Structure formats: C-alpha cells, structure tokens
Write a protein that binds this ligand. Sequence first.
Ligand SMILES: [Cl-]
Ligand SMILES: [Cl-]
Ligand SMILES: [Cl-]
Ligand SMILES: [Mg+2]
Length: 271
Amino acid sequence: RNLMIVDGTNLGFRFKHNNSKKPFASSYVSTIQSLAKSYSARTTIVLGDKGKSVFRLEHLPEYKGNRDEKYAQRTEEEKALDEQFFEYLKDAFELCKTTFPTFTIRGVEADDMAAYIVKLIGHLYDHVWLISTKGDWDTLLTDKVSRFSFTTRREYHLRDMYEHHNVDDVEQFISLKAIMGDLGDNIRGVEGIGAKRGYNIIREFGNVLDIIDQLPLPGKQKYIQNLNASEELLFRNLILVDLPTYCVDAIAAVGQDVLDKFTKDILEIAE
Ligand SMILES: [Cl-]
Ligand SMILES: [Cl-]
Ligand SMILES: [Cl-]
Ligand SMILES: [Mg+2]
C-alpha cells in the first residue's frame, strides 16, 4: 500500500568503510528488500547521485565546494579506496536495477528526483517513506510523507517538526534553511541568526519571499541589520534549498527531454 523512495548513494555510505573493501551488492539489495517489507512498500524506487547539481552550481558556483576541496586533498590511497567503493556501489546499483526501478541522471541530485516523484505519484499511495539520513529531505514531509534514517534510527514525521528542526512546518523549515544556509554545502547564512531567532522572524514577518518584500525590517538588533542587507543571499538561498518548488527546474536544467523521459518512467512505474 505504500511508496518507498530510497536515497541509494546515501544507503551505500551506510557501511562506507566496509563497502570500500568487500563487494556489497547482494547485501545492499537484501537491505532494500527488508526495508520494503518493514514499510509495506507496494512500490520501491531507488535513486542515486551522478555527477554534480547542474541547477545549484548555475546559481552558486561554490555549491559543495568544501566537499570538492576535501576530495581534492585526499591521499592517493584514500582516493583508490573511494574509487573501489564507487565501483562496488555501481555493481550494487546494477544488481538493484534487476529487482527495483533504479534511477541516476547525470547532473541531477537524488534530492530533486525524490521531490519530483513525491509530487508526481505520492497521491497513489497510503504513505510515502523516504529512506535517507539527509535532513534536507524533511522539506518533503507531510501528513502522508515520512523519513527513516539509518544513522539516527528515527522516523521523521511532520507532527514532530519542532523536535527535529526547531520549526512547526515545512514552509518554515524551507525559509529557515534559506536564512541560515549550510556550512556543509558552502551556502552562507545571515550572520547572527540561529534557529530560534530565525523561527521567530518567520512567525512575525512571513516566509522568505514575504520577508524580502518588507525589507528593511524594523529593529535595532545587528542580526536585523544583517537581514536587511541580505536580499540577494535570501532569494538565492531559497532557490538552493526549496526542494519542492524547484525540483522540476533542477531536472529540466540538464535537458527538457531528460525531464520528459523521467516523467514517463515514473508514471509507468505507478500504473
Ligand atoms: Cl572518486
Ligand atoms: Cl550577513
Ligand atoms: Cl538564535
Ligand atoms: Mg543541503
């Protein structure tokens, strides 16, 4: 009765250390099978990353530049080990494809594919279970869309949004992420705004688009002065973090034909 969407590269890292040394294709597929039973998945779709986010790099050339730097500073042995891991992950994906619908699209993040699948076919299922450790995927939560993380073991539901993310709803989460950015993705945020302040700002003035319309905001605090100077950053960050709004555009960035093919494939699966 449910749809299960697997963040497949993310799952591969589950046992990254182990998965770099010995082949894991059979274990990988049996994990997905176990998850599908646990979550009563009538349909299971596995996603992988391939290349870099063309859409996000066009908006922010420095996007995930910290991650690129780390890869570039690997020792030759670290790199070989990673190359081994990715060869094993490729084998895992190939085996996976024999059993489950499995997609990679060069230049498109798994995030965008997942968001688009939920939009396109989520209505056909009782519940949608997202298998990912990425907090960014909680921009997709609803009354009928939840996430499971293998690292934390938590099942993430919309009703628990404040516990998880210091906001009450997805619109707020998206706006807060835009305001705060993310060090890990090399996305700058507005100086002096923590989760508390940001939530309070959103509850006062509205979402980031509403905030932008009201600049300059009243208030003497330095973090308000910082916000008032940040129209460009806020608008760009919203594009970078608002998965539901931009997921179609992010797929279309690599070719309308590629988006059309993906749409066709997903609708076939859901029939
Ligand atoms: Cl590599
Ligand atoms: Cl700032
Ligand atoms: Cl704060
Ligand atoms: Mg991110």
